[PDB]
Amino acid sequence: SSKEYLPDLLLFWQNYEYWITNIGLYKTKQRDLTRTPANLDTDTEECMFWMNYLQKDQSFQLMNFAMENLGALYFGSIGDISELYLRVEQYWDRRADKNHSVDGKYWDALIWSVFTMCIYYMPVEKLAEIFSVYPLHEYLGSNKRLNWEDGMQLVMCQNFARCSLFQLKQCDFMAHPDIRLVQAYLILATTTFPYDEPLLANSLLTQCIHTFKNFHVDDFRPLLNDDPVESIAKVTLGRIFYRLCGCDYLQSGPRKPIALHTEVSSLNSTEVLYWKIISLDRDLDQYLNKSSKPPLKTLDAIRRELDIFQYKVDSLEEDFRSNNSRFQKFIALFQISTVSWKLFKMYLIYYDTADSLLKVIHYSKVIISLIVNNFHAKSEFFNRHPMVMQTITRVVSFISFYQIFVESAAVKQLLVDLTELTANLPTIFGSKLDKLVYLTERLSKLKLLWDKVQLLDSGDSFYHPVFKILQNDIKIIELKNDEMFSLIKGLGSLVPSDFRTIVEEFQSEYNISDILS
Amino acid sequence: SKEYLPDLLLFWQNYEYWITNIGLYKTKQRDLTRTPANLDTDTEECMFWMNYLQKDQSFQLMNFAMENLGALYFGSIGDISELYLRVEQYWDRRADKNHSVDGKYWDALIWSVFTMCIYYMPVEKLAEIFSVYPLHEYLGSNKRLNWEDGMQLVMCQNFARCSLFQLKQCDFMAHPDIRLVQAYLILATTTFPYDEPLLANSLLTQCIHTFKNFHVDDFRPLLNDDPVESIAKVTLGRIFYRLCGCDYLQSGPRKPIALHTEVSSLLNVDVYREENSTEVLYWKIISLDRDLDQYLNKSSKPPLKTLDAIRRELDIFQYKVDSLEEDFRSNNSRFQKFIALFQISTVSWKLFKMYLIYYDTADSLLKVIHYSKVIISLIVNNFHAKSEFFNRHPMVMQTITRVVSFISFYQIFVESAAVKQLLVDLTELTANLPTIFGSKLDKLVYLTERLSKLKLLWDKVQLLDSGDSFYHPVFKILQNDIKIIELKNDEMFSLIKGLGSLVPLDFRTIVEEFQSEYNISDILS
Amino acid sequence: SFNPVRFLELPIDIRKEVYFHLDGNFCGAHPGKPSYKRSKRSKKLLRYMYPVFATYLNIFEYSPQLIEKWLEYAFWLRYDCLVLDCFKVNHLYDGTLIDALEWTYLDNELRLAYFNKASMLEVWYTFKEYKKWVIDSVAFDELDLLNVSNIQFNIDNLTPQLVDKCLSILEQKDLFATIGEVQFGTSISVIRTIRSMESMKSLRKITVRGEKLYELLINFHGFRDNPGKTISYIVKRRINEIRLSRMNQISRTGLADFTRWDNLQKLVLSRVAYIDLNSIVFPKNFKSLTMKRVSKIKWWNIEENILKELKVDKRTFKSLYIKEDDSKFTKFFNLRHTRIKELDKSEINQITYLRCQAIVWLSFRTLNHIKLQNVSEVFNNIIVPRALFDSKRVEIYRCEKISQVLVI
Amino acid sequence: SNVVLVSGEGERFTVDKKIAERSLLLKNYLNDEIVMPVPNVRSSVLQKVIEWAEHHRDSNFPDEDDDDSRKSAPVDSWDREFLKVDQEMLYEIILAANYLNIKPLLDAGCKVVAEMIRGRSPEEIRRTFNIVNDFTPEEEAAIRRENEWAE
C-alpha cells in the first residue's frame, strides 16, 4: 500500500514497549493469595542452615577479591573497606553472643548484604576453589551432579539475600530506622533480587525512603565553620542520595506509588555523572500516558551535551592493574551508548529523519564491540552487571519490531548477531533471559504470519490480524495487572471483516500468560 | 505596663506546638547499643496469650462490640455478622499448621478487633470474665494487683505487638492487601501510636504504599461498571476518608511521606467532595482543624476572612451534628454524638484561641472560657451510670493537653478573675481521668505542676529590661526547653553514631538551678 | 453626635461590620439657565476643584440644589480617619468588603481614585502618598501584606486618550506588577489595552459586559489565526474568574466555548435573558459557576436522560416515586417557597441508584458552587445531588417562581 | 419549655424554649432547667435584646449569607427609635449581639449606627479630621498650605 502504515504502528509500538518489555516481563508477579504458607516453618530454620558454609578465610578471601575490582559498586556506601575488615572480626566474635544488640546485627546484616552482591560477580573458577558443591543438595535436593554454572549461583545468591533480609526483619527496622537500611539496599539491590522479588523490593525501598527523607537534610555543600566529621558524613550522605534516586528510577513503575525521582528536576571525579546521565534519561521516556509527542528542541540539546559527555571520558586514563577502572568506564561508555541509542530511536520514530538509521546501526555497533572485548580473559564479570538486561531487551525488541514490518538490508545481519549474542549471555539471569528468548521467537513467528496473511481494508480502517493480537496483548496485561481484582479478593466476602475466530490459532498457541508467574 | 502580651503568645504558639504535640507524644529517642534485639521471647509468649482467650469470651466480647461500640468499626467493616462467621472459622481454623495467607490476614483483622475491644472495655465486665493469675505466673514482678492497676495497659501492649508479629510472620512486605490498612484503622483508635511512634509511622508508610498503589481517584461509581465493583468502590472510599482522618491525628515531622493533599475551604491539591453524607463529616471537621493548625510552626499570621469562614461552617455544623437520625435506646448513637459534639467544641475552641493570640477581637477571652466550660460539661455528664467508656478515646488525651497547658500558661502571666476557678476545676478533673493512659497522664500532671511552680517564680523575681524587651529567667528557660527538644529530635546525632567512629559532644544560678531541680529531658522513657 | 476620638477602639470585627453596612456611599445627599453659578467666591474653585467633576459628573453640571457640595466637601474626606480607617481595614483583608479601587489619570499624577455605586468619584491618592501610611500602618514589618494587587483598570468611563496615556506611564517606571484586574463595558477602547498587555504578571479576574465584545474576546469558536490583536498564550495561564453582566443570549451563533482558558475557576454571571448550559464546554476544572437574576433556564437538558436510563414513563416517574418528605433537616433554612422532591430508598436502593448519581455527576463536570439568586422562567426541572444539597453549596435565596426542585 | 440564663452581674430571665432559639450560641449549649452565663452584658441591655427577640419572633428573618438583603434592607418601623436611645448604649448593644450570635440585631444596630454616619455634616470634617496623628505634623501643616485659599 502507501506509507500510511508506519505511524499507526510506531506510535502504538511505544505503548506496547513500556507495557511488555518493562512491566509484564519484569515488574509484576501475579499472586494467588490462597497459596503461601506460614513462615515459622520452612522460612526460619533453613536460614541458620545457610549460614554455616561461611568461615574465616573464605570471607576474608572474598574481601581480598572485593577491593581491586569493584570501584563503581562498593564506593556508593563504603570508601575503603578497612572498616569492613574490623567489623567482620567483631562479627566473628559476635557469633558467640546470645542476646545481641541492634547495631551489631545491623552490621551483620550489612556484611551479609556485602557478600550477597560480592559472590554474584564471581567468575566460576575462583568460586570453585572458594566453595564445595556437595553439602547443599539434601533439602532442596533437585539433583546432585549439577555444578555452579547452573542453579546454585542463582539460588545461593537468592538465599544470601534471604538471610540478609531475615536479619532485617528480625531486628525490626520499623522501630529503629537507622540509615543502614538504605546502604543495605544500595549494595544489595545491585543484584537480580528486585527482578526476582518486585513486591518485596518496592516496599523495602519505600521504607528506605522513610529512612532517608525523615532526616530533613537539604544542605549538602561542604562548609568551613564545622567539625570535619560533618563534612565527611555529608560527603557520604549526598552520594548515597544520588545512587538511591538512580536505583529508584531503575525500579520505577506503577507498582511503586512513592517516588523521590520527582524531587529532582532536569537541566573522585567519575561518580558525579552517573546521576547526570540518568537525569537526562527520565524525560526521554515519560511520554506514554502523555500522548504529546516531544518537540525537537529538547532532543538536539541532549545531542550536543552528549558530545561533551564523551569529551570528558576521553580525558580519563586508566590503570591497567586496577580493574576498578575498566569497570567504571564500562559503565560509562555503556551508559552513554544506551541513552544515545535510545534518543535516536525517538528521532527515527517521530521525525523519520534521514541519517538517523545509519547512526542507529553504528550505535548498536558500539555496545556489541564493548561486549566482544570483555570475553577473552579476566574480563567477563562486567556483563553480569544488570543495566545490560535492560538494554539488550530494548535493542532486541525494537530491532525485531522494526524488521517485522520493514525489511532493512544489513539490519537482519545485526539482528542475527544480536540474537546469537543473546544466546551467549552469562547464565546468572536465568529465567528472565529464557523469557526474553521466548518472546523473541514469538515476534519471529509473528513476522511469519505477517508475510503469510495480508491486509484487508474496506474504508480507511485497518483489518489485519496482527494488530488485533497486539491489542489483545495490551488488554490482557491490563486485565491481569488490574489491582481492583486484588481489592475484591481483599474484601473477599463479595464473590469475585474476517475477525471472528482467527486469533485462537495464535493466542491459544503462544498465550501471553506464559510471561507471568 | 503589659507589653509582653504581644511578643508572648506567639512564642506560646511556638511552645504549644513543639512541646504538647511532639515533646510529649512523638519523641521516643532511645540509644541503639543498649536495646536488646528480638531473636525470640517476643515470639513465644503469645501462643500463651492465644489459648488464654477461649471461645465464649470471644463471643461475649463480640456482643459487647456490636451492642454499644458501633461507631468505630463501622468505618472499617460495616456489618458485624460476617465476623461472627469469621471467628467461627478461626475457632475451627487454629488446628492446622500450614495456614494460608488469607486466613492469617483475617486473623490480623480479628486480633486488631480484640485489641481495640479490650482497650475500651470497662473493668466491671472485664474483671468477671478473665482471671488475674496466669499472666503473673508467666512474669513475676508483683503478686497482687487488679486489671485497673496496669494490666489492661500491658494486655493492650502485648495484644498489639504480637498481632503485629503475626503480620511479621505472614510477610506483609510482599503481599499488599486492604486488610493491613483495615487492621490499622481498627488499631488507630488505640494508644499504640503513642506507645510506639516509630513503628506506627513506618507501618503507616506501608499503609500508604498499600493504598496509593491502587490508583483509584474518583470514588463515585461509574455507569459502565459492575455492581459488586460499585459497592467495593464506595467501601474503598470510606476507608480512604477514615485513613486520612486517622493520618492527621498521627501527623508530625516523623513521617516525611504524608497522604493528605486535600482542601476544605481554600476558595499538589487534588480532590474535594467524593461522598455525600454518612460519616464523611468527621473528615470535614478534621480538615477545618488542619487549616487552623498548620500555623503552629508557620511564622506567618492568619488573615481574618479565613477564620470568619471557619466560624461560618461551624454555625452550619452546629446543626449537622443534630441532623443525624436520633435513636432513643441505641447507645452507639450517643457515642457518635459524643464524638461529634467533642470535635465541634474542640476545633472551635482553638479557633477562638487563635482569635485571642493574634487579633484580640471581642469577647475572645470569655468565649474561650465558655468553650472550656462546655468541654468539662460533656465530661461530667458522661460520668454517672452505664456511660463511662466514652472517655477512653485518644483525642481526649489531646484536647485536655491543649486546654490544661493553655490555661496554666495563662495564669503564670495574667491573673484573671474566674479563670482561677476554671483552672482548679480543670486540674481536679484531670486527676479524675479514666485509668488507662498510664505514663502520659501522670507526666501531663507533672508538666502541669511544673508550670504551676513556674507561677510562683513569676511574681517573686522582678524584671530586667533592655530598653524594649523584658529580661526574666522564665523568658530564658521557656526557650531553653524548646532548644533542648530541638537537640533531642534532631537525628544528625544518630548519623554520627551510625557512621564512622568519632563522637560529638544573676541569671545563671537560678536558671540552671531550675534546670537541675525540674529537668525537662525526661519524656525519653 | 458621633465622635472619632473613640471608634478606633471598637473591636475590629464590629469595625468590619459597620463598614460592611457602609458601601461606597459613605456620605448621603444624592438624588434658560446657561450655567449661572451663584457662588460668592468660587471662581478659582472651579479651576482646581471642578475641572474634572464637570467631566465625570455631567448630569449635575446644572444641579438645582447640590452645586456647592462636592467642591468644599472633599477637602478633608481623603484625610478623615474613618474613611482612611476603611482603607486600613480592607487592606488587612486583601480587599474583600468594598474593593472598587481603580486607576485614573487626571491632574498629571495618576490619582488612584475610588468610585461609588453611581460611578461618582469620592477619594483619590497618589502612589508614594498612599503606600507611606495607608499600607505600612497595617502591615508592620512582614513582607506579604506589603503587596497590593487588587486594583482594577476598568476602561468604560475613561475617554480613550486618557487610556493610552495611562498605559505608557508604567513602562518606564515599573508599576505594572501592581495592576490587578481589568473591566470592559469594533470598540476602539478595548483593543489598546490588550495589545499593550504583554507582561504584567498580575492578572486574576475578568469582567466584560454585553454581547458584541464577548463573542470576539472570550469564545474560541473554532478560530485560531488572528493576525494582530494577540491574546498571547504566555499570559493565558493566569486567569481565575469570568464575569458576565448583561447579555441577550450567550450563544447566538452556536456555542459558548472555553476550549482555551484552562486555569479558570469561577464564573459569575448576572442579569441575563437566556442561558442554555450545554452550550458551555466546561473546562477541565472549575469548581464555581454562578448566576444572578436570570430569566430563561434550560438547565442541562438531562432529566429525561434519567427518565430514559431508568426506563419508565414520566407520569410513572412522578405518580409513585415522589413522597414529599420533610424529616428533620429542611426546617432549618426557611425555603418555604420551594418544594424539594426526593427519590426513594426502597423501590430503588443500592442498585439502579448510584448509576443515577453517575449520570448526574458526569454532567456536573467537577464543580460544586452554584449560587442561584432571584429566578423567573425556568423550563426544565431543577436536579441536585445529595452531595451538593446537603452541606449547602446550593443556595437559592429569593426564590419567587420555582417549584419541583428535586434532590437525589 | 421555659429556659433561663444569667447576666453579667447575675439575674434570672425565663424566656421560652422557642424564643431562645435566636441565640444560636445558646443552641450549642442545648445539646442536653438549664442556666447560661453571659458576663459581658448588663441587665437593661439584654432587656432591650429580649424585647426585640420577643416581638420579632412573630416574623421571618432572611438567609444571612446573601449580600443582597444585607447591604440594602429596610431598617424597620419599630427599630428606628428603640435602637436610637443614646450613642453609647448602641456600642454595648452591638457587643452584646456579637456575643449572643444573633446576627439580625447585630445588623439592625448596624442600620442605625450606619445612619449616624451617612449624614454627618462637613463642618465636623473641618475640625474632627486629625483626631489621631496619622500624618506627621509638617504635612498637616502642608495640607492646609496647598489649600490656603478656599477657606
Author numbering:
A (entry chain O): 53 to 319, 339 to 567, 588 to 608
B (entry chain L): 54 to 320, 331 to 568, 589 to 608
C (entry chain K): 3 to 33, 49 to 202, 256 to 478
D (entry chain N): 4 to 35, 74 to 192
Question: Could you pull the original sentences from the published paper?
Answer:
In contrast, budding yeast chromosomes have point centromeres with single nucleosomes that are defined by conserved ~125 nucleotide segments, including three centromere determining elements (CDEs): CDEI (8 bp), CDEII (~80–90 bp, and AT-rich), and CDEIII (~25 bp).
We were able to observe intact particles of the CBF3core bound to the CEN3-601 H3 nucleosome and obtained the cryo-EM density map at 4.2 Å resolution. It allowed us to build the structural models that showed multiple conformations for the major core region of the CBF3core. The major core region of the CBF3core showing multiple conformations is connected to the Gal4 domain through a flexible linker and moves as a rigid body (relative to the Gal4-nucleosome region). Examination of the available structures of the CBF3core in the free and DNA-bound forms shows that the major core regions have the same structure but display different orientations relative to the Gal4 domain. In some of the conformations, the Ctf3 subunit is close to the α2 helix of H2B and the L1 loop of H3. We found that the Cbf13 subunit was close to the five charged residues of the α2 helix of H2B and the three residues in loop 1 of CENP-ACse4. The model suggests potential formation of a salt bridge between Ctf13 K282 and H2B E117 and hydrophobic interactions between Cft13 P297 and CENP-ACse4 K1987. We mutated the residues in the α2 helix of H2B to Ala, deleted the three residues in loop 1 of CENP-ACse4, and measured the binding affinities of CBF3core to the nucleosomes containing the histone mutants. These results showed that CBF3core only made weak and dynamic contacts with the core histones.
